Design a protein around this nucleic acid. Sequence first.
RNA 1: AGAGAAAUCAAG
RNA 2: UUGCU
RNA 3: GCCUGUUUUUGCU
RNA 4: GCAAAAACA
Lengths: 51, 676, 466, 748
Amino acid sequence: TDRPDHIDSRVWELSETQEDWITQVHGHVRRVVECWKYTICCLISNMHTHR
Amino acid sequence: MNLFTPLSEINPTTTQELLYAYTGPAPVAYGTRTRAVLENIIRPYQYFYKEPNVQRALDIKTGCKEPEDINVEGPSSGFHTASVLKLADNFFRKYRPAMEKLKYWILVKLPKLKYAELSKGRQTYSFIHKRNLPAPIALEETVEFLEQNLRRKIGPTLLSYCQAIADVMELDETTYEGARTYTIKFSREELWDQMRTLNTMWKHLERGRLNRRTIATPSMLIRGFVKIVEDAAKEILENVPTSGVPVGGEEKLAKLASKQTFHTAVTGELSGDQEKFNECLDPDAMRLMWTVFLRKLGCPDWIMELFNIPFMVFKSKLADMGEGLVYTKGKLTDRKPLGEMPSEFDDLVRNVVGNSISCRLGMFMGMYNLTSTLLALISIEREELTGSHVESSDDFIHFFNCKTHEEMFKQAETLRLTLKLVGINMSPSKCILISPAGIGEFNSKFHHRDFVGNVATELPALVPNGTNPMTDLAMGLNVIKHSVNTGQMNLCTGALAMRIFNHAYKYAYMALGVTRRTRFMEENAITPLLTNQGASPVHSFSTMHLDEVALRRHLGLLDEETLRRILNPNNPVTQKGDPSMFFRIENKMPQIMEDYSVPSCFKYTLSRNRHKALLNKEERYQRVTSIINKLFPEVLIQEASAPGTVRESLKRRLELVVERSDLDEERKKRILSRIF
Amino acid sequence: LTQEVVETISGEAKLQFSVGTTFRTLLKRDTDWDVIPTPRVEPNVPRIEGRRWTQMKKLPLLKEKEGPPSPWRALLLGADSEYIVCPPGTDQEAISWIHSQSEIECIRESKSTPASVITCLTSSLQSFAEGNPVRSRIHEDIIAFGINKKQEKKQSASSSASGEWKRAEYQVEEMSLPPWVEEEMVLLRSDQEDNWIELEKNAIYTEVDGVAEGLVDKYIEIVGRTKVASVIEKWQIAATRTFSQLHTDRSRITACPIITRDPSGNCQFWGMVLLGPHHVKRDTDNAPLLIAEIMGEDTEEKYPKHSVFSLKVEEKQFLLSLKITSFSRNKLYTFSNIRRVLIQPASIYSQVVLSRAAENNSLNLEVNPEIQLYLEGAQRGMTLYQWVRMILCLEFLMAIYNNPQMEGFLANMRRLHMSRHAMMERRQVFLPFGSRPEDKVNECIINNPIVAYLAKGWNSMPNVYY
Amino acid sequence: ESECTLRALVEEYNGACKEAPKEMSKQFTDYNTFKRYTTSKKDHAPQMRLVYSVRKPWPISMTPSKEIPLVFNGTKLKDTILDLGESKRTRANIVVPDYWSKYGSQTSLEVVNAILYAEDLKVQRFFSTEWGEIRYGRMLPFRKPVQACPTIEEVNPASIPHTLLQVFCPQYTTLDSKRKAHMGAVEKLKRVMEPICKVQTQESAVHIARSLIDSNKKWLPTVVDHTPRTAEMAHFLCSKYHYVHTNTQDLSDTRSIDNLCGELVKRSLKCRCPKETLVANLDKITIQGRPMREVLADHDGELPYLGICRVAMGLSTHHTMKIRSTKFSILNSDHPRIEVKKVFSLSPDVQVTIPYRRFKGKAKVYFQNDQIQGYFSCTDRQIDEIKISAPKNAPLLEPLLDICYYGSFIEPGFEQTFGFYPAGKREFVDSFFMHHSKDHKAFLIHMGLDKDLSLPLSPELNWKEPALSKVCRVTELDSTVQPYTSATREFVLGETLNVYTQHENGLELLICPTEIRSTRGPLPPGTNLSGSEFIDIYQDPFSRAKSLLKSTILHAERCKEFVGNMLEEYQDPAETTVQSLVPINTWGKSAKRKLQEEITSDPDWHQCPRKRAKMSYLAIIAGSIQDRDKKQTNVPRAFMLRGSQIEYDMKATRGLVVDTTNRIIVGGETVLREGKGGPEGYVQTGVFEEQPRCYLVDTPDHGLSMGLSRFCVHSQGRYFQYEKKISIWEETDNIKATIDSQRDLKRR
RNA sequence: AGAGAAAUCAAG
RNA sequence: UUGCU
RNA sequence: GCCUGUUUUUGCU
RNA sequence: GCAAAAACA
Ligand SMILES: *O[C]1[C]([C]OP([O])(=O)OP([O])(=O)OP([O])(=O)O[C][C]2O[C](N3=[C]N([C])C4=C3N=C([N])[N]C4=O)[C]([O])[C]2[O])O[C](N2[C]=NC3=C2N=[C]N=C3[N])[C]1O[C]
């Protein structure tokens, strides 16, 4: 549907009810950018353990 | 009529096809449209009050009236504000998936709408030339006007176009400077008048009505604004059960059949039209309904403003009067404006602005078929109405499943009153209710046990076009095939239509009797071998979809000796005037440009007998598009996204393709030497 | 999406749309609300006292207009059309044979079409005898084709102009149902020697194709040997021949003979169409025509504007119509494809046969059942073949008499037809308060003879169903 | 040669720059708008001019040429005298095409074959279907969307633009476009259009290619269980008065995909949270070279398991509730079909439960079976009305009993027990059907009898059969009734892989596992279950071992996990595979000891593929089925797989694994090629408008084969420089791990 | 003349 | 120049 | 002269 | 996307 191909389905589903995208400027683009940031956060924390 | 009413074998419904005088001439309009335009202007003012009082109803702006003001024994122009609010609330509370789809369209589909979609239209009034021009021409001139007045570049999105339209109205003065050379100027008031101006004209070749009607068209300055509202209305209507306008063909019939459930003790069916439609609807009611829809969805203020622009503009509509009411002294027929001498439209003289007349009430035009459908549907949603309703624009069908007859009568009266609460009046003479359901009509589709086929709705298309014999044959066969598949014509009717079309097609191409073509073929021993050449037909009832040449080759009626001649890609008959580009699958050079001809020699073109400078500009656009397509094959499958200007992009692509030509170095340098 | 992405990253976040100050003032001129309306009324749906729905116990009775009987207002004669048998050959040879062996004598002259224009026709014959379908103007052409008639009428009106300017107030004369419509129905159906429908048979590959072509052949042989087919062929030939000569500007006289050919090859002269000086700028404007054609029987009350002539050819007597008319390009093109009218009676026939086949799960192809119809106010049986025959007759009669009145009448008669069909199945019909479905039909009944004929047919059948 | 094409392009570019100084200073993306300006191609009405146009003295307009003689025998052909040289200037008679049909230059036969290929397909397809016998039955139409023409391949719409780009312009594509394309369709289209593109222009060739691989469904009225699954011959095989009984097999891979999906669903339900397990596996399984998500998007079938897997991937489904031979569809209802958890305990302590479903409120359900179709309206459990359309004298036992089972209207078998305690749901339902087959009096006592003879249903359930009394509230269908949905349904995949449809007042069950009945079928060709956690699906020991070895060798982390779980008797997702690959032996402890020496001596073993192969071999032997009686012996150098003559070797010198210094081949396929084509893929790593300092490969293919660490591709004036992937994990795995950690931290 | 039907054509 | 049953 | 909306059938870019 | 044709409101 509206999900970009690079955005994971789980990330897209989780981002639906995080911010009220309808009132924001470029709500779809803002949601895509937030998904980008969350995916970057996921890639930073990837199978790394300390204790 | 007695010959059309069988009583033993077939029912009268199957004879509804006999109540069609088609294949005879269609009525046309002859003279001045001013009388019809003025009637359309004056009708909304005559229906606002129970008693006709045009003068008192001319100074009102918003057509909101009290419940006791609404006329129940005749047309009622106007709406009840509280009723509209409550009904829109009820319609939003129900059909939540439709509102979710609306939200998705606003978030996703709306920002990517392109103003080039406005080019899909037809003859459009031009605020520059004061004339009807083709939609691409008007779109280009409006875009250039905006470009040179705002001193900026409009984005491809329709939102950018609407923002440019909003911005250009802020300027005190504007200039076009077409330079076909000629310079024209506009003020804020002049541009305001031109944007809210509807050019009117006669509608010709329309069947099914005694009196000629007038059509209208606005400029490109408001078509873009209406486009967003129409798209949103379509998005809502595609997801509501009670809509009938966005679905067509067999899908509409399936939707109708899904609601033909009659199980209760009393099962009635009411099929009808709405009288005086498109002139009893106040655009303020549409504003209120859209505002409620976008406010319960949480949309911001700019969405509301954008959705409200078109209806506010049409509240100030200046319908273009014709060329003057006709007056007679003796046998003379002179033509005078509205205000010169008294007539039946004197009360509207105060509304005359130049050659146009203002109309606050009504909508005068069919630019909101989808929005008017939504306005009709919101009134349906209430606890009293429990039947199934289908509404396209002004044709509606309703199914009542009630325990008792009086309950059905109360439901029908409630339906009529709710439609009147918004500004939609049932046509009493055109509304028929059958208390045992099963027989009905919708969009000229009649049903008794199943939707019967309607012959004579397919005969106007059973005429060869003027492209070429092969295209004409394919179009005729496929039209008959779709008619058969739809069920309009059966086996015998399909075959008879095929034979009639074949005979007309052969006559149209000089393939019957003794003609110049037949004499030339006979004197040179040229056997026909093709349908357009007078040979026996190869298409059968079951071979509607099959191409003539391939079928004749398969059956052996067309030998390879003539096949290698008629299908020559180098025949002079259909040779294109310009070299064309060709792909090469798994080749060192995937791009080969050479002269080409249409394969079939019978796919020729017919010579024609022998916004002016804009046509030359569009020819330049054609040249640029052709070179882009030749140099950028990938945009042939996907949208254009190359960065930079056209010149630099094609220069880089040309350098790249020459670099990959596998030629030696010197060839490459002397080729890139001559690139400008 | 690069611009939008960069904008969201930077954070300027332009609202994508904004209405200025003066534009808002312009918008709020013709409305009582702002750009975003916020009415101060509580949302509520009031209760309105409505009317009561009334049952339509009896079907409406369409009113019949009163006045002089309608004349035959059509391009060609119809059932009175006849032809002259000529030796086989080309059109020029046939016209040369007719002209050199013909005597013309005026027997009935009408004020609408002066007899003196007969010379025009003969001149055209002369012109078309040596293979010149276009001839120079003669004096009588001015009378025949109304050359410079508009200017003369304008000058006469200006000379006779007196009084004060008033509105148009046009009037359409109402005329009653003529007796000749029933005769046209009774005629136009008699058997003919030839088939008059010679359509090339489609290919047959499958059994579905076989049954389809069998049904088509049955329909052709049950409606072929009929005067309707001959008149349809005449109309189509005349329309095509006159249409093909109208895609240009000419100040001269063009002859468009109406000639068909039998299987034996002998020519059949239905008449000739003379196209006067035409300079068409649109597809709806009229062009002058002079229609000479062979009658079978002359009626004063049916052809008041026709000047009937007696034509003597090889010890044979014929009648000639020779009417002055103005006709349009669009109508001529429409009548060029008049053969499409055969589909609807074929639709009825095929529906009956295929319904019987589906009921019995087997195709018969020779069924001629007994349709029950209201013939003279009473329900009697009638064979399917002749039912299809005069369905074709009436379809052709309506096709050549299609005008706004006919379009409106047929469009508004469908509701009454559906109501009647509902009531014959013991279904009650209910109507709104001010419901008068008959008015929308009565407004279209003015002077069209076939509209009046259909109205009489509707009135004849019962209106109350028990 | 190619030089003339370059000259033509350069001259055209120069002319465009000179003749149009404007219209090219605009942005390239503006082509999306000004391509739509195609006026001057408009004519008033060609149908009203054809008769006159053909009969003009010189009707045909054509470019000047010398092949057509100026004057042929007697007649003059071309009007080449007036203004010869003005492009499409020459005027010729209508007979010139007739003159060219004979006495003309010919063309090679392969050109003629290529031109007519698309139409010849239709011609032979028509003259290949067996024409049955016409049956006349007064058909009641069912309006549904059907595919217009058959396709050589089934490709989801989103992959259509990328597939065509892979066929015509590989040189202007990126690796993402390559991965999103259907490579089987790409190869088929390339083979088909290799001759076609020589006689068709670029846009024409694209048109035929898309028409070959696009669906283009259109709404038509068809006949129930007689749809020709294509509108190509709909006008011939059905005409509302007849059908032609035609025979045609499925000729598709949809059933194999259903078998794969059913195996995945059945094996997924045996673990914790089956939904996440199935979603994770479907994102790692591939068929041929296409990922499972895209092949699911390709095949939009009517089957249950296919619908479950499509819903699991966020797609829709067309499955409808079906009880044996009768299909049901809820037209409208007040509340969803409520489940009842009725318990039929066999003992105070031992209980057996058979949940069922019913209606709560008023509902209306359309049903159809064979030629019988109609609807029934009910309230709660009492049937209110039944409308049926069926052929005369047809037996209506099974449709009515299916209706009763669907609504639980009849209760010798609902809310109570038949008799002896039921063994389970299967036996209970079978007993219900077999009892009510010979006892239909429950229907009669449910809706009584009527003294009116006009009712068509006979007491012994025959349509329109004369009798003494008739069944009440069952009448002939008045008007056509068909299920239609306006709003696009969105499906919810709940636990136990239950596919629900979102109803207004709750959730409407659509597909429910544990009662879907289907025998095991062949897997789709090219299925690659080497992803994770599911290898026992393969019946062949060969492929079953090959997938496991591909998983272990190509992934160091997977090899480490496999060795760790296989040495200390931990839970291994592929225990059954290892048990079924190695016969009963006594080499377990010896192999475990060998694992001990080779993990202690070289703890860094899990980077050399040879070491990974040796460790995997030893681990697979270690956890085999150890014989109870015989004493442990030394591990053999090579052994034999169960039920096959396939030899598995330690040193991989022969048999299933062969590891030469140049390359490693597993199961006849080169899993590793040393030097070029590393095991891990590539990442895009940069988009530029200017040539990067790398190697510009011609296409995405001819890339990924040289094994370069830096290569660029071109796409619409932009450059994409793929370099290498160095991260051992994957973005999907990273996202899954992050979300799992977040949810666990929320729960804990 | 005439065609025609709510007003036009009947050329410059 | 002119030929549809 | 020839509006808007929906659907359908062709052909061309 | 464009051009033509048709039907419906
Ligand atoms: O509107 C239209 C659209 C619709 O369709 P669909 O189905 O969706 O498909 P597609 O196409 O893919 O879509 P899109 O994406 O939007 O588009 C794409 C691109 O590319 C192009 N193209 C295409 N195609 C097919 C083609 C082209 N070009 C040429 N020349 N040819 C061809 O073929 C386009 O333009 C774009 O840009 O879509 C489209 N389409 C369709 N079809 C067509 C088109 N276009 C053109 N043409 C055609 N034929 C449209 O829009 C745009």
